[PDB]
């Protein structure tokens, strides 16, 4: 299938080159797979989700995203217009408050939650977790992510927007997960994007169009935006049968566009998520 006049990020991910406008992808579209969105919640009634999204857990007084961050990320994952894996299932996990804050024990609780909850879901093609949040280094947070990954879930985490080595941030620094940097239109490292050896792969994170609260849409920038492209991509490849949860991150780097990124410091990968589609 082919989505004409798609947002740049989707197009980028199905091209070997920057500057195109069509998003080429298999019609299967990540159906049969599940993506947990661990953020501020999802606005589940948003028409773009076609009813494929639902909140599953809150750690606060409400199950609603009064922030926008989560709804934006979910859209990049599998919303009709704005998402990678247009027919996936989405589950919202609200670990962050409407102010976007969240204590580590809550984020650790949300991760253990996902590792358990997935057992009572019907997700034949597999399970993915998309985590566009972070903070200063923490071993417990890291270990929570590792557990999640080990439980059989594709874990993808934002590298952070400090324009620093991600090694000092969690859970970006956990080696076992899929730490995602951000890029821009022109195949440049996004200026805010963290870097370092712990990075596994890059994705589009600058000026990404996505769903927003109140049934709207918004362009925003960040490693949060990049993270979902990858999680959405993994979900997609899992339904096609190309890879598994355990090996998705590796697979994505093997098959990536290599050497195209600029502004990539020595020691960081020059790897750009790529679906390798061929009609």
């Amino acid at each position: 299938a082919a989505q004409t006049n798609a947002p740049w990020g989707l197009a980028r991910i199905s091209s070997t080159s920057p500057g195109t406008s069509t998003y080429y992808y298999d019609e299967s579209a990540g159906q049969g797979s599940c993506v947990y969105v661990i953020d501020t919640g999802i606005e589940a009634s948003h028409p773009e989700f076609e009813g494929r999204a639902q909140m599953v857990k809150t750690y606060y007084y409400s199950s609603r995203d009064g922030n926008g961050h989560g709804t934006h990320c979910a859209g990049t994952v599998g919303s009709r217009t704005y998402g990678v894996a247009k027919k996936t299932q989405l589950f919202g996990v609200k670990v962050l408050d409407d102010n976007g804050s969240g204590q580590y024990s809550t984020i650790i609780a949300g991760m253990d939650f996902v590792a358990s909850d997935k057992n009572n879901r019907n997700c034949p093609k597999g399970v993915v977790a998309s985590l566009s949040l972070g903070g200063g280094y923490s071993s417990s947070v890291n270990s929570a992510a590792a557990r999640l990954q080990s439980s059989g879930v594709m874990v993808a985490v934002a590298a952070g927007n400090n324009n620093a080595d991600a090694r000092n941030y969690s859970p970006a620094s956990e080696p076992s997960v899929c730490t995602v940097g951000a890029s821009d239109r022109y195949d440049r490292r996004s200026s805010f994007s963290n870097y370092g050896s712990v990075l596994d792969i890059f994705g589009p994170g600058t000026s990404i169009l996505s769903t927003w609260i109140g049934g709207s849409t918004r362009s925003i920038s960040g490693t949060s935006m990049a993270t979902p492209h990858v999680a959405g991509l993994a979900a997609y490849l899992m339904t096609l049968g190309k890879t598994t949860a355990a090996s998705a991150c590796r697979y994505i780097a093997d098959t990536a566009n290599k050497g195209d990124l600029s502004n990539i410091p020595f020691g960081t990968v020059n790897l750009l998520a790529y679906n390798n589609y061929q009609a």
């Binding site: 962050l96 580590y104 949040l133 927007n161």
Partner: peptide, 4 residues
Amino acid sequence: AAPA
């Protein structure tokens, strides 16, 4: 944490 915070959102990214």
